[PDB]
């Protein structure tokens, strides 16, 4: 299908794979409100994105994805300034073992908050029409990385919550879709297009690796 | 190796599976510092416990596993009383989806904090002697529960952190072992305390996930 017209919210996209994601969506005809607190990097990201895209299809917001109030405000501003929402990308994350409290409050808590907000603003039952919510993870959620325990715990929690809430939505008949991405950056953003362009792929985990390009792991 | 004369600390033993754990230890002679938050369910457990075992082999300290200032003081007083520490058991848990913050703060954060405190108090690198640390998870950490996503998050996080910290301490040459056990839907509650002892028995196992199912009995996760 054509992703044109749709509205998307990608979290933490001022630099890196996050930013990459936006490009694809912007080049696919959608309109993206990048969300990240890296204002110095986010403004430059929007500037770079503009040169090949009309400036009304790129917005930016500043909110660290750790507080429910700020995340809710960001979602409200997205759906207001654009009128709706169809695509959610929860990818903001930090790699750190020392202050593992933050490592666990960022990767796992904020993904759940974002998915609940996406269900709220997209669940057929309570308005809207649905769409898709994708959470970004890594092999640490599927492999034990002895080097970084808390990282492995966060990724495992994400890859559990994704399936749980996908089953919940599928039982509630709410339109919202949930999927999880666990790769080994343009090839990474080539996964959003692969997943979003098929409504028969919900509540699953996909892997991007050098062995098989893009594929899906079967439980 | 030997279980007699050791010292163990099980969190949340005022009732249920927790209690089973404690009792089994006193069958094998290990001295135990019970910990839980429901003091009402704890004092009765203590009274029923010292009946079959000498008064001086057990103690109880009431605290929540999520308050760091309390989980440090519990370990400190336990070491002060028994003079050592060898076995740690993180069993505190709750099912709740309304205040979904607390499910994670309890099932996941408290386990990690207790494990780190135990490693500090047991690792050969800092004047300890060694022992074992054990964490309680469930099949929720290995299969999706429809209505309880935060519970799955906590269980999965515990599985990962155990399997990682075990190897982290193993390669450092610390001596301590870390493992996590998962029971079935409770299945005789004794069957879980019949498992805890097993972990303290064997010494060639580190970071093993034990699963209980009523079709084959007891097995371990495959990776
Ligand atoms: N580490 C890796 O190599 C892999 C990572 N991923 C996913 O990609 C994410 C990052 O990938 P990278 O390309 O390495 O980018 P990165 O981690 O270097 O980029 C982080 C960007 O997001 C922002 N950010 C991070 N956490 C945030 C938070 N809690 N609140 C607000 N802004 C936040 C940072 O300011 C920065 O703008 C990881 O979190 C994970 O989701 C996926 C597979 C492998
Ligand atoms: N609930 C069940 O029947 C089953 C439990 N499990 C696993 O076994 C663990 C123990 O469950 P049960 O013994 O059946 O529970 P229970 O319903 O018999 O009692 C819960 C125990 O946890 C303690 N506890 C709860 N939150 C605590 C906290 N924040 N700090 C300290 N202690 C706390 C309570 O004091 C009580 O001792 C569960 O956490 C779960 O990991 C798995 C399968 C079935």
Residue numbers in the entry:
A (entry chain B): 1 to 184, 222 to 256
B (entry chain A): 1 to 186, 220 to 256
Study authors write:
15-PGDH acts via its NAD+-dependent enzymatic activity of oxidizing and degrading prostaglandin E2 (PGE2), and related eicosanoids, which provide key trophic support for stem cells in multiple tissues. Specifically, 15-PGDH catalyzes the rate-limiting step to initiate PGE2 degradation by oxidizing the 15-hydroxyl moiety of PGE2 to a 15-keto group, thereby inactivating PGE2 from being able to bind to its receptors.
To further define the predicted functional role of the 15-PGDH drug binding lid, we employed cryo-EM to solve the structure of the 15-PGDH-NADH complex in the absence of inhibitor. With a similar imaging processing workflow, we were able to resolve the apo-form to 3.3 Å. In the absence of inhibitor, 15-PGDH forms a looser complex that lacks certain structural features because of enhanced dynamic flexibility. In the absence of an inhibitor, our data indicate that this lid of 15-PGDH successively swings between open-and-closed states in solution.
